[PDB]
Design an enzyme around this catalytic site. Structure first.
Site, PDB file in Angstrom:
ATOM      1  CB  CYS A  99      65.638  59.921  44.377  1.00 12.13           C
ATOM      2  SG  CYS A  99      65.227  58.439  43.469  1.00 12.13           S
ATOM      3  N   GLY A 100      62.883  61.477  42.775  1.00 14.61           N
ATOM      4  CA  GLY A 100      61.511  61.315  42.312  1.00 14.61           C
ATOM      5  C   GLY A 100      61.099  59.890  42.005  1.00 14.61           C
ATOM      6  CG  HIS A 101      62.588  57.491  38.775  1.00 16.28           C
ATOM      7  ND1 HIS A 101      63.611  58.023  38.017  1.00 16.28           N
ATOM      8  CD2 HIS A 101      61.512  57.413  37.956  1.00 16.28           C
ATOM      9  CE1 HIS A 101      63.169  58.262  36.794  1.00 16.28           C
ATOM     10  NE2 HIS A 101      61.898  57.899  36.731  1.00 16.28           N
ATOM     11  CB  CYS A 102      63.391  57.153  45.658  1.00 17.88           C
ATOM     12  SG  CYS A 102      65.043  56.799  45.042  1.00 17.88           S
TER      13      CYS A 102
END
Length: 111
Positions: A32-35
């Site tokens: 997950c990029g936002h993670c």
């Protein structure tokens, strides 16, 4: 790849870990990029609260322990949940910068 103040929970220990006191948990997935974007902030949050007697900062990898995630209605990432004395309290959907997270922590520790 551990970080000071940051618990990494598993299916074996999660429920026992959150049973007493207050907890702020990041449910994440490695993909997950936002993670990824949030990870250093979360590490700062954990370090600053390392010695707290009232809150612990954790994270759960939902690719490894998915039942923990679905059992807490986690459906996407990152999901930032508050627990108190073994129960899910809130799904924090406010700003995710360090100072906002700290202000939210303090708001949940007024008892």
């Amino acid at each position: 790849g551990s970080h000071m103040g940051l618990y990494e929970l598993s299916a074996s220990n999660f429920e026992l870990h959150v049973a007493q006191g207050d907890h702020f948990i990041k449910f994440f997935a490695p993909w997950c990029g936002h993670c990824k974007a949030l990870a250093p902030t979360w590490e700062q949050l954990a370090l600053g609260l390392e010695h707290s007697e009232t809150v612990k900062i954790g994270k759960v990898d939902c690719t490894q322990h998915y039942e923990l995630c679905s059992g807490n209605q986690v459906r996407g990432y990152p999901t930032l949940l508050w627990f108190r004395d073994g129960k899910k309290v809130d799904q924090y959907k406010g700003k995710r910068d360090l100072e906002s997270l700290r202000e939210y922590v303090e708001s949940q520790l007024q008892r």
